[PDB]
Amino acid sequence: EPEVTAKVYFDVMIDSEPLGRITIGLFGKDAPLTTENFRQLCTGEHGFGYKDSIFHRVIQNFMIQGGDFTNFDGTGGKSIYGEKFADENLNVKHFVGALSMANAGPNTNGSQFFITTAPTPWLDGRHVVFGKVLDGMDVVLRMEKTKTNSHDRPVKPVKIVASGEL
């Protein structure tokens, strides 16, 4: 496993229901630019970030997806470096509990990420794995079972009510 160089957290709610804290460890040595973008979006030092954003897509036995704090539908988001930044490390394999950057092709990393819940080998080599859930995996598995109506969107918002560095 890669080395954990930092710890960030999400506090999750689903409509008048605290789900608990998800603790995330970052692979700051294998993906320094990617972890710094994620870390500073967790704290919000640049005036924007993950606080009060939602997980807009939930696919059972696959992944949950969030990070679109501009359009809330999977089309938006932006990095702290600008619009998009380059793929760093592509040799890390996905695993249950991994943090991985969503993209629209090579070198299109913004702020959208997913947390894998099952083996997803068809993403390997094409998405930058930059962290893992250290604690609160049961919260992730609870979020994964939420009711999705259409387009794999949760019928009730799965909201990150708080985020930052631990």
Specify whether the CB–CB gap between 135 and 113 falls below 8 A. no
Question: What is the fold of 1-166?
Answer: Cyclophilin (2.40.100)
List residues with catalytic annotation. Answer: 57, 62, 65, 103, 114, 123, 127
Q: 23, exposed or middle or buried, with CB in 10 Å at 0-12, 13-18, 19+?
A: middle
Which ranges in the chain belong to alpha helices (H)?
A: 32-43, 137-144
Provide the residue ranges of all domains of the chain, joining segments of one domain with +. Answer: 1-166
Q: Structure solved using which method?
A: X-ray
Evaluate whether 22 touches 140 at the Cβ level (below 8 Å): yes
Instruction: Say how far apart CA 94 and CA 79 lie, in whole Å.
Output: 22
Residues 100, 113, 59, CA angle at the centre, nearest 5°? Answer: 95
